[PDB]
Structures are given as C-alpha cells and as structure tokens.
Specification:
The structure is cut from a larger assembly and holds 2 copies of chain A (429 residues). By secondary structure, chain A is mainly alpha-helical. Chain A has 21 helices and no strands. In chain A, 45% of the residues are buried. The structure holds magnesium ion (MG) (2 copies). It is classed as hydrolase. The entry lists the keywords dGTPase, nucleotide binding, hydrolase.
Chain lengths: 429, 429
C-alpha cells in the first residue's frame, strides 16, 4: 500500500501527519547541514581530481533524485488516487530517494570494506574476543560482522541528551535508506538481495520495528528473528548507488591513469550508442571531457533503464517477491560486469589501494584496542588520558554492548585526519 | 514581466522553449557533475571541522532553494496566470535559485578577495603593466579589477571545441547568477547595490547582452556602456549567500576557538528568541550542538524575513528602483552588523588568516608572471616548459586580451594543491 509507504511520521510524533495537511525536502535540508554529513569532506574513497565520499554522496543523491522523480511520475499516472485524494507529487518521491541516497555513506568506517573487516576481526580474533561470553549471540554477531549501513542508521537516528531521534528524518526516508531490513542473525539465510547483510544493530531493533510497522513493511520471517521486505524506494536508492559506483569509478580510473582511454569507448559504445553525438565526441580535445561526456550518457541510459525495470516489476517489488536488484535485470549486464571487473583489476587491486588498506587495519585495530582497554579499566592514569583524548564528549551508565557499539560508531565516524593523528599520538609520534 | 524572466532558453537554441511543452532541475544536475564545481572540494575558504568552498556552496544552495520555493509559492498565489496558462511551479523558482546559488563561488580565485586583489595588482603595478597600451580601457579595467563573479560566468558559459556554451544552463539561471549586470566601466557610478562591481568580462558582453534581451532586463544605462537591472531572483541568491556568510562564519569561528561561546547566545537571542526551545538548548551538553541549534534557528528566521522583505518590494524590485539588498531591510540589522564585525575582528584579522593571504599573494604573483613571460616569448626552452606545465590542454590563435583573460581564468581555477605544487616547481623546491 503506497499510502503507508509515504509516511511523514517522525520520532516522538503523537498526532498523525497527513500529506494534504513538515515535508520530505526538510530531510534533505537537515542531512546537508548535519555534522556527520559534513564530516564526509575529510573522508576519502580508498582511491589514489578524485572523489571524496562527500562528492560520491552528492552524485548518488543526484541520480536517486532523477530516478525517484521519474518513478513518481509513472506511479502517479498509474495510481491517480495517490494525488487526487492523498495529494502526493512526484517531487515527493524524488525528495525521499535523494535524501536516502545522500546519507547512504554516512556511517561507513574509513578505508572502505577493509575498515569494516578490521572492526569485525578485532572482535573475532583480536582483543575484542573477551566480550564474546558477556553478550548475546546476535549482539556479538553485530560486533563481528560490522557494516556501515547499520552504523549509518545509528547516526541518522540516535538519541542524545537534547536531541531525541537524531536528525528526526521522515519514516519514508528511513525505510528507503534501509537496504537490508533484517537482524544480524541468521547470517545470509537465502540468496535474496536483502539478506546479504543486515541494516540495523540490536540497539535499534525497537526503533526499526516501529518504523516498519508505520510503513507497513511485510514481515518475511516466521521465527523470532525479525526481518521485513525492502521498501520499494530502497531499490531505486541502491540502483542509483550502483550506477555511480560503476560509471564513476571507471571515470576516476581513466582520469587517474590507471585505465587507458581505449577501454572507455570499448565498454561505453553499447551504453551510449543510442544517444551519442559523434561530432561532439570527436570535436573534444581532452580525454577528461570525452570521458565526462560518456559518463553523462551512460548514467542517463542506465537511469532510464532502471526506471523501466522498476515499473516492470512494481507489483512483485511491492509484494516482496523480487530477490535481485534493478541493475541485475539490465540488458547491459555483460558490459556492466566487464567494467566492474576491469575496475577491480586496475583500481581496487592497485598497490596504492592495497597499501592504504594495510594502514587502515593497523590504525583501526590500534584505536579499537585502546578504547576497549580504557573501557575495561577506567581507573588507571593512562586509561583516563585515553578516555579524555578519544571520548571527551560525555559519559553515562550504559551496558557493555551499548559501550562497545558506541566505541565502534565513534571509531567509524572519525575523519581520516583525526584518526591518523590519534593513532600517531598513541604510537608516540 | 515574469514570463520572460523564467526563460528556458539555452545557448544555440533556435526554436523557443515553453514551460507547458528541458527543465530547471537539469541546470543543478549539470552543475553538480561539472568539473569546476568538483574542483571546489580541494579549495579552502580562507579560514584556519571548517568549511571548504564546496560545503559553503552546498549550504548556500540549500538556503536559496528554500527562499526560492517560498517566493515562488507567494508569486504563484499573487499571479495566478503564471501557473494557469504558463504552467510554472514554485519548484521552478526553487530550482533556479538553488542552481544560481550553487555556482556562486565557482569562479572565485583562491585566498579569498586577497587573490582577486593579487590578480588586479599584477596588472596594475606588476609585470602586467606592459599590456596597458595594447588593450582598450575597459579590457585593461577588467584585468586590474578582477572579480570572481565574472570569472564564474566565464566558467559557466565558455565555449570550447566540442562544448559550445559550456554547461549550457538555462537563461533564468544565468540571470539569477548575475549580481552585477554591468560592464567593467564606469567604476561604481552610483551607490546602487548592483553597481558595486561588474559581473561579466569583455569577452562575454555579447553573450550576456543576448541573455538580458531574452530575459527582458531593463536597460538602466543611456550611454555606450551597457548595464541592466538585476534579475529579481538574484536578490534571493545574494540574500541566501549573505545569510550563510553571516551565521555560518560565526558558527565556524565559535567551533574553531576563535570566538568564545558567550557571544553565540549574546548575538543570537534576538534572532532565535521567537522560536527557541529553552529546554532543548539547556539539555544539550556540547557547544557544537548548541551552536548548530542556534544556527538553524537563525537561518530559518532570516529566510522567512528575507521572503517577507522580497514580497514587500516586489514591484520596486521588478522595476529596478531597489538600490539595496534584502538583508539591508532587516529588523535584525544591528545584530547582523555586530556579528559581522566580531567575525572580522576575530577570524578575518587572525594571524592564520593573514599569513595565508600573504602566501597567496606570492603564489599568484609568481604564477601570473610565469604565464605572462611564457606568453610574450614562446620560443625559449624555459617558456616552452612553462607552457607545457601550466597550459598543456590546447593552443589557438587568439588576441592578446583573450590570452590574458584565459591566463587569469586558468590561474583562478587551479586548486590550492595544484597551485602550490606549480609554485614550488617554479621556485625549484
Ligand atoms: Mg555509494
Ligand atoms: Mg557565498
């Protein structure tokens, strides 16, 4: 039911909010001005001009806003009652998808997936193994299979003294942000696209249950482990992100010298052939302009194809029977796969990227060990100094799992500069 | 006439474009993906978390989008025919103002106004004085009173082989971007707000004349020096920029330790008193959260006040008789002035900001002198090396003024990193 999916409800609301009577734009406005989003300006994208996480978020938001606007147009033309009595507009869908896409990278720890694996391995085989017997199975699982999507949900909606609900985003935006509406256990029960990872920690189970019950998400789990169907706009958000990750990593790889210019045309002829102006392409004198020209065309065709795919399986998506992505139903699957493999071989496996990941591991391991050692023995002078350096903000009487997840969130959201400086101080440099 | 002001015309168009038959959102989308806008991620805001030019542009765009949406609502309710037959929406106004505000900092040289003065002084008393007799009075004036607004217009609309019209933005966006629709001469003929500076160089006179004739801007000059009235949405763009420059420089100054916390409340009580929740403010435990809370409130009230002021003088603004800014008609003028003066005394006059400006002067002077010396004698080996290092892109048979303005644009749009590296290479470091 689309009426419940486009909920304007926020945390702490008592009276129901109706479309015909704050707005989805306000979510984007709040995310833009938020400190965690601003902090993305000092966070890199594990590549050797090259995009930072802030620009990637910006570009993803721009693709998601286009996808959502077209999808809202088509749904409003398919469900007249959504605008006749409920008063919804395609700009609403665009705003929801753009706000969800803008914050999709707000909780990811530095150094890419290597940082996530470092946080996981710290609690699996490192100093964090001591907490295994003091936590429940799902809590420990969250600790060992730490992902930045659950951390991003935590950042977007975590209460603090004087700020309940965090950014207080609308429930539609929160639902679109959740790509994996399931708990930390069981680990990958099936081949469904939404079961690859989890989207919320144990400290957010009640809040996401409230969000799902407000949005009317279908309960797909018959056991005691909660799991819901994906929000239909989460498909658009993820498709936008994949389109950017594919076409823009290739642009960045080509412009940085890691990928020769020939592969650009070689893997973009199929994508851009239907709309390329050959005279304009040949008239361009710089490689950067040509690759930008190709990137714009490819993004446009992929956006249109994703909209067509979404409207092809709307009923299946709303029922929860869709087990793959919108980009997986692409006619350009071979070319997309070839581009992804070439990017993996030339960028992600480059020395510079490997070197950086090896440093992240040592920095994150050191910081996590220092924070945990301070947590266990908060009486020594060195531990008091560590607490002052890394957690001067506040202190409270919380549980062990809450403290550990707070440590993980604080370490994940540090800027590369702040993390490196703290690691050097702790290492006496 | 508002119908002509909301023009969808772009460079090279032959058939007229009508609202009821590409869209103002496309301008924002293009600016986001443009290389010059991306380059703002490596450009600082001459302050010692602290905003870069990209985040300032982002925040300004967000304020301008709010202002434009409210102003469009009120104009559509005041002119029913703008939506009944022409089919315009308030989202159009919001998109135009947001696109204009996003690119307002795209042509400014580094090191703030110190860089602009360095470029001016290079041609006034430096090595550039040799070109005074080889150029017209207005051309030389443009060289010596170089501003980043004209350079931003150049960046947004300058033709290149394979790219005619640059980003090919809509004419409404270009009109809203132009804060000073006048030539380089005469220099400040009156006290009008639009006559403080100029908005386009001599190489863009024909293009901006075409833009003004398409938008129906009123010719305010009876002499041979062209000058037009401000576009009504340029007032909103400038008001948004001033609101951010005032409230956010104060936030940055407070958070950086240059401004104590007391002045925050002292100068924000009047602005935020009508909408502040005292319980929420006192419950916050960190200074950053409190100042963010105050900044959001102040931005909201200033936005509403600016909308009210704009609708107060709509007829005067459309006739061209308005000689001041929207922020100049504020009831909070004393508090705004006090905040600006405190920011000037504590941030802009800080050592760190002074030191940086003294370095900009030497870097920009060195780079401009090297480029000019390469231009005059393009036969020596050293000059060929300089041309390869600083201008490898392309070469053409252009006039002296075109070459000099191209040199100025290229130097102004270099990233701080690229500029510093080139200056060190030239200095043999
Ligand atoms: Mg992404
Ligand atoms: Mg500004």
């Amino acid at each position: 039911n689309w009426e419940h999916l486009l909920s304007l409800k926020r945390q702490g609301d008592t009276a129901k909010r109706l479309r015909i009577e704050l707005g989805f734009e306000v979510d984007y406005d709040r995310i833009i001005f938020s400190a965690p989003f601003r902090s993305l300006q000092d966070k890199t994208q594990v590549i050797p001009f090259v995009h930072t996480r802030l620009t990637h978020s910006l570009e993803v938001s721009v693709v998601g806003r286009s996808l959502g606007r077209m999808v809202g147009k088509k749904l409003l033309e398919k469900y007249p009652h959504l605008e006749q009595v409920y008063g919804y507009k395609f700009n609403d869908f665009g705003a929801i998808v753009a706000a969800a896409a803008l914050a999709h990278d707000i909780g990811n720890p530095p150094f890419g997936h290597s940082g996530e694996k470092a946080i996981g391995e710290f609690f699996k085989n490192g100093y964090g193994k001591r907490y295994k017997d003091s936590l429940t199975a799902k809590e420990y699982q969250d600790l060992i299979k730490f992902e930045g999507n659950a951390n991003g949900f935590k950042v977007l909606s975590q209460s603090k003294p004087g700020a309940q609900g965090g950014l207080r985003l609308s429930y539609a935006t929160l639902g679109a942000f959740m790509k994996y509406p399931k708990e930390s256990l069981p680990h990958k029960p099936s081949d469904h696209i939404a079961d690859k990872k989890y989207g919320f920690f144990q400290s957010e189970r009640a809040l996401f249950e409230d969000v799902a019950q407000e949005l009317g998400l279908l309960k797909r789990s018959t056991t005691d482990d909660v799991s819901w169907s994906r929000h239909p706009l989460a498909y658009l958000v993820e498709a936008a992100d994949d389109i950017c990750y594919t076409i823009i990593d290739f642009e960045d790889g080509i412009n940085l010298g890691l990928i020769p210019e020939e592969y650009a045309l070689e893997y973009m002829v199929k994508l851009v052939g239907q709309t390329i102006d050959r005279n304009k392409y040949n008239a361009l004198q710089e490689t950067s302009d040509r690759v930008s020209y190709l990137r714009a065309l490819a993004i446009g065709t992929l956006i249109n194809e994703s909209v067509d795919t979404f409207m092809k399986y709307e009923e299946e998506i709303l029922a929860g029977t869709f087990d793959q992505s919108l980009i997986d139903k692409s006619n350009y699957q071979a070319q997309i796969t070839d581009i992804i493999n070439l990017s993996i071989e030339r960028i992600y496996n480059s020395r510079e990227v490997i070197e950086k990941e090896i440093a992240g591991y040592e920095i994150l391991s050191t910081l996590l060990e220092a924070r945990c050692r301070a947590l266990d023995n908060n009486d020594t002078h060195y531990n008091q100094l560590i607490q002052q350096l890394l957690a001067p903000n506040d202190h409270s009487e919380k549980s062990l799992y809450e403290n550990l997840i707070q440590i993980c969130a604080e370490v994940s959201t540090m800027t590369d500069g702040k993390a490196l400086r703290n690691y050097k101080k702790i290492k006496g440099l």
